[PDB]
Amino acid sequence: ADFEVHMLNKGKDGAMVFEPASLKVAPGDTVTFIPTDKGHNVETIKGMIPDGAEAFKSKINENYKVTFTAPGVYGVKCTPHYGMGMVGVVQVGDAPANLEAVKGAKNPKKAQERLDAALAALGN
Numbered sequence: 001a002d003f004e005v006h007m008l009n010k011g012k013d014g015a016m017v018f019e020p021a022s023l024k025v026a027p028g029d030t031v032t033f034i035p036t037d038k039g040h041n042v043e044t045i046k047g048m049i050p051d052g053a054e055a056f057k058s059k060i061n062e063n064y065k066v067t068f069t070a071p072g073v074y075g076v077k078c079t080p081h082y083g084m085g086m087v088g089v090v091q092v093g094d095a096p097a098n099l100e101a102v103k104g105a106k107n108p109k110k111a112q113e114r115l116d117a118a119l120a121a122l123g124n
């Protein structure tokens with residue numbers, strides 16, 4: 001199954017957001033990150049990727065397609081707007097083994113407020 005995540009300058013959650021900010025996919029699913037507005041990209045957050053997973057970083061303005069292979073929770077950010085809180089969470093499969101470790105990862109304050117909300121919406 002294929003899912004879409006859009007990158008916007010303004011959404012229901014405020015400025016510089018990923019929509020949706022939290023998504024549960026299955027092992028092997030594909031998510032396409034699409035900058036609806038210009039100036040955004042997607043990159044994995046340091047310490048918020050499962051064991052076995054490869055980090056990634058898309059180019060600004062590109063539609064980025066990723067097939068998630070290793071199960072667990074992945075923290076993602078927009079490079080330029082990470083300090084402003086532009087972050088999302090992708091859970092791949094059931095019972096993420098790295099769920100406790102991603103909760104402890106350190107992020108700038110606004111990014112931390114949105115990641116905690118997003119982890120809570122997954123039922124974590």
Ligand SMILES: [Cu+2]
Pocket residue numbers: 007016039040041078079080081086
């Ligand atoms: Cu951005």
